[PDB]
Amino acid sequence: MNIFEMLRIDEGLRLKIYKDTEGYYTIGIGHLLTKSPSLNAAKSELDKAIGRNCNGVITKDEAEKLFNQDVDAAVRGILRNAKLKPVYDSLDAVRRCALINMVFQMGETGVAGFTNSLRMLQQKRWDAAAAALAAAAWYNQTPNRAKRVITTFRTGTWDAYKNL
What EC number(s) does its UniProt record assign? Predict the structure, then answer.
């Protein structure tokens, strides 16, 4: 396991331009092509995106590439964040993967929200926080993924996502 894998599973890879919960054009694992209500516009950021005649579709790999760009973008913000930073430097690769997922899923601000939660992640209190995360709405709204992200903070192993 790795983050891409973990997100393919948590957000799924869509290989064709699709709309979101917000109705914005998206591709792969949440890559926002654009906020303009316009297909051809999507289809073009798309082409400038990876660069070629994809015509509303991409490769598993290509998608894979964007994701990377994305993941980076995220971490960047993450460092760029007062509240989060300290927590992530302290974390561990896998639990970092965990923090990305959330960040992926609810933006810094959001994650930045989970106060006492983050504290415990900091003091490496893997139980303390697990339950505390099970306590929020995020859990009720997205039971599973949230069940999983929490187990990955809990144990700090991909067990929850599976294996070979």
Answer: 3.2.1.17
CB 42 within 8 A of CB 33: yes
| 104 marked among binding-site residues | yes
Distance CA 4, CA 13 (A): 10
Q: If residue 4 lies in a helix (H) or strand (E), which one and from where to where?
A: helix 3-11
Contact (CB, 8 A) for 31 and 126? no
Indicate the SS3 state at residue 17. Answer: strand
- The domain defined by 1-164 folds into Lysozyme (1.10.530)
Helical H segments across 29-161, by residue range: 39-46, 60-79, 85-90, 93-111, 115-122, 128-134, 137-141, 143-154
**H or E segment and range at residue 28:** strand 25-28
36 annotated to bind ligand: no
Catalytic residue from among 5, 20, 89, 127:
20
Q: According to the entry, how was the structure determined?
A: X-ray
Structure tokens at 89: 């430097």
- Is 33 annotated to bind a ligand? Reply is no
